[PDB]
Amino acid sequence: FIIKGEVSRKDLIREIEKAIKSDELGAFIGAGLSIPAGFCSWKELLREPAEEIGLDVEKESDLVNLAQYYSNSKKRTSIDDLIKGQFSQLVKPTENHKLLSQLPISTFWTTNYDKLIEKALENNMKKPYVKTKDEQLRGTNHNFDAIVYKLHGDVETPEDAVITRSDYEEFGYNKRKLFREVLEGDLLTKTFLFLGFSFEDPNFNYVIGRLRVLLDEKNTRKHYCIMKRVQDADEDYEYKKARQELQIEDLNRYGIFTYLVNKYDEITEILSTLVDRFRRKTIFISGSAYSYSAYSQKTGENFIHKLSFELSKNGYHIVNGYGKGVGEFVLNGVADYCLTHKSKINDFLTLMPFPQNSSLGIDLDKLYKENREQMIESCGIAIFLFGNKEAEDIASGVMDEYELSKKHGLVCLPIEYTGGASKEIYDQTTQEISDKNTISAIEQANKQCDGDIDMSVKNIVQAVKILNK
Amino acid sequence: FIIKGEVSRKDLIREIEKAIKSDELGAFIGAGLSIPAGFCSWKELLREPAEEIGLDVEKESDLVNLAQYYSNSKKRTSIDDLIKGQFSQLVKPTENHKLLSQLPISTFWTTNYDKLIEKALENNMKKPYVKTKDEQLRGTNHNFDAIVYKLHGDVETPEDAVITRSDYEEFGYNKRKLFREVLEGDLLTKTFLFLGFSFEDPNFNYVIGRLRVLLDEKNTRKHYCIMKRVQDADEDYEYKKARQELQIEDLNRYGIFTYLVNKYDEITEILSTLVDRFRRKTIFISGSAYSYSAYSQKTGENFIHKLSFELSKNGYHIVNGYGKGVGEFVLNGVADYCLTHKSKINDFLTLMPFPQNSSLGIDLDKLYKENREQMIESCGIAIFLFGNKEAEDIASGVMDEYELSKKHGLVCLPIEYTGGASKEIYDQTTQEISDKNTISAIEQANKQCDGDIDMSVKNIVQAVKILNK
Amino acid sequence: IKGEVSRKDLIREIEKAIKSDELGAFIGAGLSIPAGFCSWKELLREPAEEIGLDVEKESDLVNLAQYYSNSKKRTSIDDLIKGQFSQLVKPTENHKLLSQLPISTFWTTNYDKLIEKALENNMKKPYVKTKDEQLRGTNHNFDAIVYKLHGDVETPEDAVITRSDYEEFGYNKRKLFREVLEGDLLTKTFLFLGFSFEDPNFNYVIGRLRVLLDEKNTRKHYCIMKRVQDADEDYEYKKARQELQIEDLNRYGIFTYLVNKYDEITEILSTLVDRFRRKTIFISGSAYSYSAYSQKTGENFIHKLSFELSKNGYHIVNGYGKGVGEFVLNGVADYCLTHKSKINDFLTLMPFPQNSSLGIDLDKLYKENREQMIESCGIAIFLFGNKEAEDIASGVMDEYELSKKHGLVCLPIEYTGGASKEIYDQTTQEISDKNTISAIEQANKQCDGDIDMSVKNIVQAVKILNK
Amino acid sequence: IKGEVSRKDLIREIEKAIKSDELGAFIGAGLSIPAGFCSWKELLREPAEEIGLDVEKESDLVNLAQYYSNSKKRTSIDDLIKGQFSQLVKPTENHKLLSQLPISTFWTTNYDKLIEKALENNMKKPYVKTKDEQLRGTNHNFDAIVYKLHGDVETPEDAVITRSDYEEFGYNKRKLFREVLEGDLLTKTFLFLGFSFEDPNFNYVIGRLRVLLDEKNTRKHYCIMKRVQDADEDYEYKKARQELQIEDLNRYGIFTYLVNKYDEITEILSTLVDRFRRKTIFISGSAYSYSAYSQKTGENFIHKLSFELSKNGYHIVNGYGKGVGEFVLNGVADYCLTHKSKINDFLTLMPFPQNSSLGIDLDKLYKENREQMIESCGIAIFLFGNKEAEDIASGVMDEYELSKKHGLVCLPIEYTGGASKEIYDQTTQEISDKNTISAIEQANKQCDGDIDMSVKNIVQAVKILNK
CATH class of the missing domain: 3.40.50.450 (Rossmann fold)
Structure with missing residues (x-):
């Protein structure tokens, strides 16, 4: 809690309660929040595909480039079928999803392809407007109880999903022209809570690159994140802890602070705390x-x-x-x-x-x-x-x-x-x-x-x- | 009602009622709607300024260039003082403004500098969010009952108002960077009702230029307008009627249709009709x-x-x-x-x-x-x-x-x-x-x-x- | 009057730009009409009657061309420029003098090819650029480039004539012209010739120079225009309007010399040729x-x-x-x-x-x-x-x-x-x-x-x- | 394998580009490391220890340079490139051969000035471009231009090294490089030399060529890379990875020749020089x-x-x-x-x-x-x-x-x-x-x-x- 960008649980809750008190609270969520629900990590999801082209997923450091090579050798459809299949699973949302639905969060941005985040709201009294293409962002709308931006696409249209390297390269040019400015605006105006993410994700560098607007010294805006502290079980404990420390100090440049849990259950303990105190x-x-x-x-x-x-x-x-x-x-x-x-x-x-x-x-x-x-x-x-x-x-x-x-x-x-x-x-x-x-x-x-x-x-x-x- | 782009009162009402039935109705308003309330046309407003530099307002065809020359000879402040003064008048909104407030219009765009359009809503049960700078358009917001975009600025900050020629040239570069895309989006998604405008306005060419997005053959979108038919009193009646016809046929290229009244009171007759039928x-x-x-x-x-x-x-x-x-x-x-x-x-x-x-x-x-x-x-x-x-x-x-x-x-x-x-x-x-x-x-x-x-x-x-x- | 300059001041500053190869030329209708081409008022007279409007009563010829293109389809103006602008007229003495000068960058709004041929009527190898595909990348070989902002008579379906041709400028077509022109305007010193505040497309043309309003602009450019004449009705009034308009140009870093007859243009170019030779x-x-x-x-x-x-x-x-x-x-x-x-x-x-x-x-x-x-x-x-x-x-x-x-x-x-x-x-x-x-x-x-x-x-x- | 080509095919197509002056060169670290410069792994070893990380364990050297720049302020990397990259090393035989060839457009990611001096070590007048102000407008006089995408050693505070230097690329600085590079890539035929899929900045570099994925792209470009070697562990595996990576490049219209020793690069350039002379x-x-x-x-x-x-x-x-x-x-x-x-x-x-x-x-x-x-x-x-x-x-x-x-x-x-x-x-x-x-x-x-x-x-x- 003195490493730069590190904060205590009470610090996190205080600032989050400010964002709630001013209706400036939004949520940014990733794959780390849907994997506990029953979905497959990308490593395993690409294991058999990796073997299907003659490469071992254990040997590849960049899974994004792996998905690209796979899309080249086995035509793009074979990844659509991979996402259409292994992400359309009939899975129930987690308790974290329900707690997020109960909170006064009107704006949701996510990079995962599942639809749990919408279902948690549909189960509650809220009726989300899930947006996936520019045509939905054009103009303005005031009606819906919440907006769920599927930044990296959705499982209902995997042929357009952001998966391979060139899908990130072509982000905003052939596809998703307006997502960039709407996201940058929400980042400069709302206070966002980041959850399902880890520095070790395969898509991380590409994800963080979008936040370049927060590097402007005139940003003044603060956001908050949650991640798991390194654990004794993890080999090379001291070294990975140093890497994680420097990774958080690099993150803080974009105005993002971090709280560290020791097991993911602790996330819920905070969400619940915020629901109860808000209730x-x-x-x-x-x-x-x-x-x-x-x-x-x-x-x-x-x-x-x-x-x-x-x-x-x-x-x-x-x-x-x-x-x-x-x-x-x-x-x-x-x-x-x-x-x-x-x-x-x-x-x-x-x-x-x-x-x-x-x-x-x-x-x-x-x-x-x-x-x-x-x-x-x-x-x-x-x-x-x-x-x-x-x-x-x-x-x-x-x-x-x-x-x-x-x-x-x-x-x-x-x-x-x-x-x-x-x-x-x-x-x-x-x-x-x-x-x-x-x-x-x-x-x-x-x-x-x-x-x-x-x-x-x-x-x-x-x-x-x-x-x- | 066969001149291209011309429509009947019943046609207008039918299509407007479709936009209302689908919550796709917005309003675009100009100076022609505030002048009857008590505000000065730009011709007279620039008469004394024109004389203050040695030019006659009766001899100048382009009042925008006139305001530019004036801002050059007499420093910009002298136009701010002109707008700060002759547009901050303690004037009541018109009946048209109240009828527009009573309608289910959530999005308002206007080029005039007055604040009548906000007051008609504040008098009704609606609480508008008037937006004038990019910083307000960033991100998204769902809260307010209606949004009033002051496209050409507002009288509360005349030093930034869009008045002179170079204020139109610098539109979107030094100022109002995000207005262009938000307006183009609303134009491609909403059905807009155009009111306080005339082909003879001094700022017209600059205003219509923003609608270039509607020239794409893939537009399919229709909007509607109201203007006064030429009148016998107007000298060169037949010639000005031909000019007005060709002006409407040019307008229809952007997907805008026109209804023609013979006196401006008729506008209210339609608005009231839509209020009653909606009530x-x-x-x-x-x-x-x-x-x-x-x-x-x-x-x-x-x-x-x-x-x-x-x-x-x-x-x-x-x-x-x-x-x-x-x-x-x-x-x-x-x-x-x-x-x-x-x-x-x-x-x-x-x-x-x-x-x-x-x-x-x-x-x-x-x-x-x-x-x-x-x-x-x-x-x-x-x-x-x-x-x-x-x-x-x-x-x-x-x-x-x-x-x-x-x-x-x-x-x-x-x-x-x-x-x-x-x-x-x-x-x-x-x-x-x-x-x-x-x-x-x-x-x-x-x-x-x-x-x-x-x-x-x-x-x-x-x-x-x-x-x- | 701010923005007015002396003839010798003009020659001196222009020769400074010449001393550093920072000289470019910006040309308009004022140089092609004297060669034998028809002013736009007359060019649009018969079309104007062809839709029921008088060129004598319509002050905005750009909107007029739009109305005509609307009633009579685009093709009929493609045919119009093909006709009274495809006259194979010889370049003027001004064009030959500009060919003799060391001007490597030429930007023009004209639809004719007078300046290009005047350069061809010499040891010069002009490269006419009219489409984005030609501006792509980089090239150093050609002796000089003639940038045609508003198109060319060989492809009138793309020419910039009507109002919406200006509205769609840079979006569907001529996407790269905007930034390349701004670059040449911020680096070279440009001499403006065939233009007047009384042109019909002026409001549209001047907007392209908005980058020169950036207070960080050190660059100065120069133009030549016709002085008002006593015979002209409202003489003192038009002198006041032109005075304030000249002070308006200087916001873009543009200075003005005033002639009493168009011959003076040739006198200045000629002088600059002699002293350069x-x-x-x-x-x-x-x-x-x-x-x-x-x-x-x-x-x-x-x-x-x-x-x-x-x-x-x-x-x-x-x-x-x-x-x-x-x-x-x-x-x-x-x-x-x-x-x-x-x-x-x-x-x-x-x-x-x-x-x-x-x-x-x-x-x-x-x-x-x-x-x-x-x-x-x-x-x-x-x-x-x-x-x-x-x-x-x-x-x-x-x-x-x-x-x-x-x-x-x-x-x-x-x-x-x-x-x-x-x-x-x-x-x-x-x-x-x-x-x-x-x-x-x-x-x-x-x-x-x-x-x-x-x-x-x-x-x-x-x-x-x-x- | 798709995208592989024969040595004689390479020479033939390259000589076609030469026949039309459509030839440009794209150069990277693979040509400057053999001259005497330090690979990045070693260059970052002492810094890596200076923050508690091992270059042997960190696969992403760009993120590593970012972490170092974060703990030790930017200046200390400004000083780093100033040091082990400011070595006044002579250009290689490859550089002199490229000087003898008719290559007028040079794009490079290197921070050294080897190719620029190799051109100066000749009748050539290189114009090194590193900032937007130099790309503005147009110029034809200079004998050739060397575009330095990732900066230069004379101004390391602007060099593109850390991750966020790539993130802020084109927004705060180097705004015009993006479109000008895309232009040269769509018009010229480029020969790529000092690069390998195993570079640390590759993911970042390749993104610049996204315009070449437009199906309307007719242009072909060519590269040279090191073939896998039996001694290299996981030989067949690395051969498969490199094979699929070579097929990945061809999406951008890039073809590949595979050498067994770096000497072959010189053999090809030399051949092309002889046949051009x-x-x-x-x-x-x-x-x-x-x-x-x-x-x-x-x-x-x-x-x-x-x-x-x-x-x-x-x-x-x-x-x-x-x-x-x-x-x-x-x-x-x-x-x-x-x-x-x-x-x-x-x-x-x-x-x-x-x-x-x-x-x-x-x-x-x-x-x-x-x-x-x-x-x-x-x-x-x-x-x-x-x-x-x-x-x-x-x-x-x-x-x-x-x-x-x-x-x-x-x-x-x-x-x-x-x-x-x-x-x-x-x-x-x-x-x-x-x-x-x-x-x-x-x-x-x-x-x-x-x-x-x-x-x-x-x-x-x-x-x-x-x-």
Whole structure:
């Protein structure tokens, strides 16, 4: 963490959180992230081809030149068939891919030929626009949730894929004319997180050459990367560590810093950390109230109103299941906020009501329960309120939503002085806590706020703010 | 309408509606659209400057060369001061600007130096991203509601504005390096509507030169323009008409077609036509029901559910004021639709609830009423339902919303067999109709649908579809 | 007015560019219209009526040509330039003078081939470049290149005429012309001739020089244009417009000289030709006997004179005469061997063989080459002029009349005798110029057997003629 | 194997490019390392240890140079090339042979100045181009240009060495080299010499030729490389790799010849020099008396021989001898006047003046110029060789020994007499080649007074030597 360009895990997270706080975060990904999913390294992929022309893949230092010689002796199609085959595998994305989908990353650039990165987004609520030819980059578009640039092409059109040496030589001339400037722009404006790459890749020199724009002293821009530290098992340990050090110091010239893991699992540990800490910006609200315990009806209505309002004032997104007695006034508070500050409500509120009569005339409970889980896994905090009706002392839905939040690792914030299932969750859950931050938030929220609502809503707001740091 | 490149008003509207139906619509605007707002033509703006160097503006055919000579004799600053002054005028946008803001135009390109085009959007709900230097075009951005390219610069930085001849010569070299490719892309991908321009502009040749990409036979792309037909008052009528004809036939080489008005007011007539016809894609729903007339509670709930559901199935956006008894189930129906087809609700529903307790502790009725009018002017249809409580035979809010819809020219669709204020509006309004399409929709909706809900919701859906053609 | 210059200032700076081979020429319609070609206004009159527009009312002839090409297809303008621009007209006196000057880089917007043939009407080997394929790579062999920016009449389908032919310039065709022109503009000093702010394509032409606006531009270029005339309506107004336009050009490093009649162009070029010709001298004579000198002394006087003429950077044209020319070769060969140079760089010979190569008369061809060779010289030095029994050698006297025909400064030497001395007795009485007379006096001074004094006299007389 | 060619095929196609002046040369480290420069592996050994890396373990020396430049600032490599590459080493025999060949365009990646000085070690005027400012515009004067793609040792701070020096190539610096190289590659036929697939910068170098992959490329280029050797480990494997690599080059229109020792390069260049030299001939002699001919007949025989030698496209080198050389000039002048050509294009003279220009001995300088001039000729023709009383003229016999020194094909004429006939009597007995003997027989045939038969004999003997 003093080798030039080296940074600590906390340094990495701090700067990444700046990029997230300013919507300047993008992702740059390579083969190192898809190989753990089940895809073949290029060495083995070229082993049999290498033997098919009379050369040993173990003897060749530059696999790019090897693919070129192969394309010459066995016609180009024979590499298309190699990529069409060994990269169209029916493989599931990794957990890293899902965590990347959950993050606020709108721009993705990748050199691998697989389609895992798109599927992680399609599985989440995001609908990517995957771009592979100049014709898609022309002009501008504002619509899609995210853009996935397939810089080195895609497995759906391998005859155009960037594989051989002359495919890199002809990059931008016969093909991909506009990729260069769009990539250089994203590199100078966004803060990028680099993942699936290694200095020992075969295509590395060609990949790094595109970043020549970052050598301009006027760059000022910083990007961050992750790679595996050299390991004792690796023979020539000290020598390869020196090589890797000089390789990172060379990398830092382009404004890229590096964090070093010891096994690739550690990558996920960071991504998850960033997902969880980001999820706490999105809160889940549960409850149902025919009666508002010690509060009068209008007082229990305006307490909810002023709580959702204050949560919007501090920049928090709300997910609610539009419960009886609760949802109308969560909406009312957020509408009061957005009307006060000429803001848009859909920027702050996502609802999950429970329909009565499916128009199609078919049960939708399965679909509804899945939608609910999809919304909840995007949340990081769960606040529970009331949970009572004339015949429900402990409303069922509230308890079901607590168990569901307990599954997704949400920080649970039951409110004791509301009664009902909310207080049942307080009485049960308070015995199952161990962390200082969570305990501090729980205590800060359930205070004896005199019944008075201003202090009552604040207590909860400060409990929320505590969990964000 | 047989001169090459000439088209009829109905032709123009048809093709424009294709571009709207495919989100491929953009706008290209010039000085001819801001002069009616109160700004000075360049001829008069250069009259005193022309005299300030010993030349008569009446004698000079090329005002661009005139601005160049002026910048030479009187230093460049003296033109900056000319633009800083005579273009920073505290002028209101025109009705054309507001109509353009109301349309689904996400990309705007303009050569004028004023800021009317941004203000028309800021007045509407849209928040434009005005781009003036390459640094803003680098990379990509997905966030903003619309992009306003100031191709020839802006009055906020006149020292960089494109004015003189050498400012066109140095276009793209010392300044505006990326504007050329972004503009060419938008021209080859979007369908553009050209407005504030004339063949007699002084900067015309330079402006049209950028479109050389459209001369490639592989262009296939079509764009549309509007200009004033020559008028008897114009001396040399027949000769100038021949010149204008050949000018349009030359224009059509770049894939641009032309419609000819006789006075500029006619422009607005078309824009309005496109706004109104587009507004009918967005429906306003009004009502309030403690009791559901001849329907049981659950039956009146599921009727609303199945109506909003069917309206979402046919691709219509809903604006509702979350009324008593009505809003919960408008939301429920749209949520049923979006959950059935894994769609997002905010794409279909915009709400305007009426809060009870302002958290700030100040009356918000003024703000709420303005928000309501802003939402309603975006709608083209108004459907009224029920409008009754225990003490309200004719709910007040429903009548107030009818008078408000009557102000904004909405097609009013009251439902008779719901009773209440809805039926009061039917009984009063049906005497104030004159158009075939509106009358046909009103009759198609209020049919004797047996009380049965499937036919009842259809009746209304077909009444809506009728007004869209 | 900024950007205006004096005629003598113009000649001085242009001659500086000549001194460093940094001189190129940029030519336009103003040089081809006087030869017999039709102005564009008239050339487009009948077409203009052919679409319903009047050339008298249309100020923008480029857009007019576009409209015509639109209604009547491209072919009909391919046929138009093929017609009234394919006239096989002889180049003007300006063209021949430019051929005589050391201009190796020619750029032109004209569609005719006048300047190319004017160069062909000489010892020059022009290489006309009109397509990118010719600009590719590098080549040094050809004597000069004529760059045709706006195409040529042999391929009018590619000519740059209409507006969109300018719009598509450099993208579909003529891709390399842009950067190569900018290079020549940033390295050479260019002389602009056939152009006026009132041309129809001016706005389009001037855009190509935008590189000269870079403040890092040290290069200066020069142009010649027609001054406004009282008869011209709005006289003072057009004088003001032209004044401000001249100040506008200077942004590109272009200066302007103003003529009152187009003849002045020829007067300047002619002047520059004359003053350039004096760097290369013609020598005449023949010595069967070495008068006033012993044989060896008359041989080495010639040898040591040609050597010093080469040392002072003057090119020699000689007819390899017996006894006079014979040793000029040896003297210049001694120079080039002394200074590791090549002989043809300093000596051009004009011999007369004894036997035709394979049976053909050569007298006419020889004299034609001779007259053209003398038109390349600016000074004519005469020496000896005697044969077996001819006190006044035959060729030398006619060569005096021939140098007098081509306006060469005649510098005969008296103390050599023969036809040279008869020409001396004639020329000293048939002159009126102070500089010429002063140089002649500096040349015919003498110490006698001391030959260095003679060689000095002659060399210093030459330098006097070059001031 | 595709892209391999025969030695005679190589010579034939290269001589086609020579016949059209379309020949250029592309040179690399393989020609400068044998002269005395250090391979890069060793040059980077001490630096490699200076950062903790072994050149024996690092396969990518470009990335290695980058790492070193990163830890130790750029200056320390500026100093490195300044040191072990600034050795003032003499050019090799290959360099001198390339100087003797008609190669006007030279492109090289080397940082030394061997090829430039080898050209300076001749009559050549090299113009070394290393910065964009020199490529701007156009110029035809200089005798040849040496393009230094990767910089020069005089400005190592700009040299292309590290990886990022290749990345920043054409963007910050050397902006115009890319398009000008592509032009020369698409128009000229280039001969590649000092390169191998095992070079460290090869991947980077080959990318510049991507334009040659355009299917519209008709141009063919040629290279020479070292064949694999049995001693080399993995012999058959390296033969397979090199085979596939040779087939890879042909995509760029590049063909390959394979040597077994680097000497073969010199053998090919030498061969091409010899066969090119025979297009230019040296003539010796002097005729105080015109043996076997009347005076006028011996004059016009020489005249009409030089004329026909010019007609058949052969350049003449003559020492302007009295009676022999004197009329060569007249004959070639008649030719150039007949065919509107310039004399120095066909005739190069080597005179010997009577009096030093201003008092300096010239014998040594004259003979040095002479030996270099004869090394430019491939055939030596001897004629007459007599003086006032010298049956065997002095200069001519030594010139026979001199042509024998430089390996010229000696073609003396018997029926002229003098030293020429003594050389004829010596040479006919001192030869062994069939072609040389056949041409000599074709030359010394005779009809006699009929001079056309004599001129034929000689010209046809020349053409026999050029087959």
